[model samples]
Target: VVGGTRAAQGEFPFMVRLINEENEGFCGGALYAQDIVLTAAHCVSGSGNNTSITATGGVVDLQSSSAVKVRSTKVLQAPGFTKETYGKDWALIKLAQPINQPTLKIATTTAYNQGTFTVAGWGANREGGSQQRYLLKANVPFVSDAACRSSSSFILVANEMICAGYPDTGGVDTCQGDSGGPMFRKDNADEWIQVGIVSWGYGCARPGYPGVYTEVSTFASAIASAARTL
Candidate 1:
């Protein structure tokens, strides 16, 4: 995440890191089930050149050996995910072994009138800088669909996406490589519910351009179905 703070170990047990076969960190993700990881559609590149991907969880420090790593045997994206618009940019990763970490609950309601939401990732702090080695987190204000669409840099589709960031400030938002990370809110039940999946934006933490995410509540059933059967 851009303009965010580093998270301490065990801060977010649901957090996971996606590393390519070359041992390069790529995207961030969240554990939804013991063996299922939730991420972005663009994160999973198909098999080629002896390439594979693993989801590492249960650690704040990416370099820590105490973290649990599970290889993804299969990957599935939400139906009708389009690269052109990045709509429906959600993905599910089936792990070869169950990750022994806390799983984030999926939000079922579509009402996103909450105040602030938390976004965490290992993405770049700057536009072209290297991705962070340790996890980072930020608390960004939620933007309504109208507010998000009003921005010249954003064109939010109804119920499909949500925006979060400071409206007038250029700091505190997610960035590149943060894709597929979690945008979560604490519910009335005091449970961390994942409301969004980090998707995209014009640039990292720029004024008038809040970060966009794939609204998860809208696809709750689909996500559950995929997690159960796929």
Candidate 2:
């Protein structure tokens, strides 16, 4: 996360660092179930079979001893996904075994019309900087669909995608490696509910462009169905 504060250990229990075959952290994800991890489609789309991808969770620090690393058994990307668009950018990773970690709930409705949302990751703190060793978090206020569309030149689908960041100053946002991470908020029950998945943006914390996310509410049913079948 660019221009964010350091996060404490276990501050984001459901967050997972997606490691590639070369043993490098490439993306971020959230634990939807013991064996299922929700991430961005682009993260796993080109990988053949996806067994080389590892999902590391339960620790904010990448080098923490308490981190739980599990290899992926399969990956299910959204069928309608095309790299040319922003919507349907979500994917699910089926782990080899269930990790003993807490999971996050997916938002079923788009009731989050207002209020701030929290996003955390080990992504770069700057536009072209190296990825961070410790997890960082930042709070970005929600930008309305109309405002979001007018703020950027990117082709963002209003219903399938959502925007969050400082549109005027643009100091805080998700960067390169933050893709597939959760953009979440607290629910009425005081539990974490993922509202979006880190998808794309123009650059790291740019003034005119806010961070774009895959709206979880739009793909709630598809994700649930894939979770059961995968």
Candidate 3:
């Protein structure tokens, strides 16, 4: 986005770029474990197998030579997930090999409805634009579930999704290719904890439309159980 600043290498150490077979960026993902990456279900929805995608980590600029790429060996979508409802859009990807990079801690205490959060991605700078070469970050304030439901675009928002960004302000937002990215906040320990996964929005940085994300805290139990099996 125009309002976001380019992030330096290691600025968002847990960020991963999801690329298709041709090495073209399609979505964003986050590293949560040695072989586990978390992303949106829609990102891998139609892929026949995990091998259809790759995860690139430890890099700021995709065009740089230092990116660590790993193929996904397994992919698991949330039970009963569907695009028709647009809820429960989280997915877990297991890399063929560990990248040995830093990971963002996940939230389990329901930070969904509070505090300002940060979102970073290689998504398009504008709606329908090309994905950016470098990682970008923006600060977005959280919107309560009640207020989020008030918007027609968010009528389907459930415990599974969290809303962020300012509809009226309209500067920062997650756009195309940002889906499956993270919406995180710093903990009291000054460490980042991801609380949301970029999922959907009406349009890029549109007035009266905030971006929606998969609320991490709501699926903590399922995520924990799923990760254990990977």
Candidate 4:
């Protein structure tokens, strides 16, 4: 099990990264199951014409955690996959074989209105600095969808986009390599359920502008359909 104090921030508990050839361009993703990796459709849209890739398990475990080889054997690209309008910014990577881990549950409850959630990724602690090799963790609040789009340059990116991040945490949020990582929600039961996926952001830890994520709750049916299809 992925455990530690590294989750004080809304860091990930069950996320993985899709690595391009030679470990180039890593895309974040939520563990839907041991075999299915839930991530942003943009990550798959840019998945290069053809090559070999795999998803690495564990947030802080650069080694050890199961390294499941993966590919886009099947993908239910949202209605309109495009970065221009930000439509259908999500996808699914069906592995040749089922993973060995259990998929975390999607938050079926309402969104947070200032509640702290966790996030984790290998992003640049600072915008201009090198990418952080050690997994970084942080806690952020989930603002109302209206409040998020109203305060930032990015608007309600279709009905699918759900926003989460720290607009007041001094700009600390997911970064480049974090797109598609888990933006989780927890309850009083002492259980943390994932609710969003790191979708996009302007910069790392930039003040006034927190990171935005795809609302995983909104796409439960889509993700479920894709995962259960095969």
lDDT (Cα atoms) of all candidates against the true structure:
0.82, 0.87, 0.83, 0.63
List, residue by residue over 1-230, the lDDT tens digit for candidate 1: 88889888887889999876654649889998888889887776532222277888888887888978888887777777766145778888888888998899988887653689999988899888887889999999888877777763566676778888986776878988888889998888777889998988887887878888888888888889877775
Looking at model 1, residue 49 earns an lDDT score of 24
Alpha-carbon runs more than 4 Å astray in model 4: 1-13, 22-24, 46-51, 63-72, 109-114
Error of 4 at 217 (Å): 1.5
lDDT tens per residue, model 3, 1-230: 43688988889989999876644549998998967888888787643245777899989899888888999888788887877246888888888999779987899887444799999999888877887999999999998777766663467547778888887667789999888988898888888999999998888887778888888898878988988887
Of 2 and 3, the candidate ranking higher by TM-score: 2
lDDT of 1 at 40: 85
- The TM-score obtained by model 3 is 0.93
The true-versus-predicted C-alpha distance at residue 113 of model 1, in Å, is 4.6
Please provide, for model 2 over 1-230, each residue's C-alpha lDDT reduced to its tens digit, 9 standing for 90 to 100: 98899988878889999986755549999999988999998787542367888998888889988888999988899987887165788999999998788899999888863589999999999999888899999999998777777868677788888889988889999998999999999999898899999998888899988898999999999999988887
lDDT of 2: 0.87
For candidate 4, write residues 144-165 as lDDT tens digits: 6676666676766645666566
Q: Give the Å error, residue 132, model 1.
A: 1.1
Better of 1 and 3 by lDDT: 3
Instruction: Kindly report which residue stretches of model 3 are placed more than 4 angstroms away from their true locations once superposed.
Output: 22-25, 46-49, 151-153
Per-residue error for 193 in candidate 2, Å, reads 0.4
Q: What TM-score does candidate 1 get on C-alpha atoms?
A: 0.92
Best-fitting candidate, scored by lDDT: 2
- Residue 105: error of model 1 in Å? 0.3
What residue pairs are clashing in model 2? none
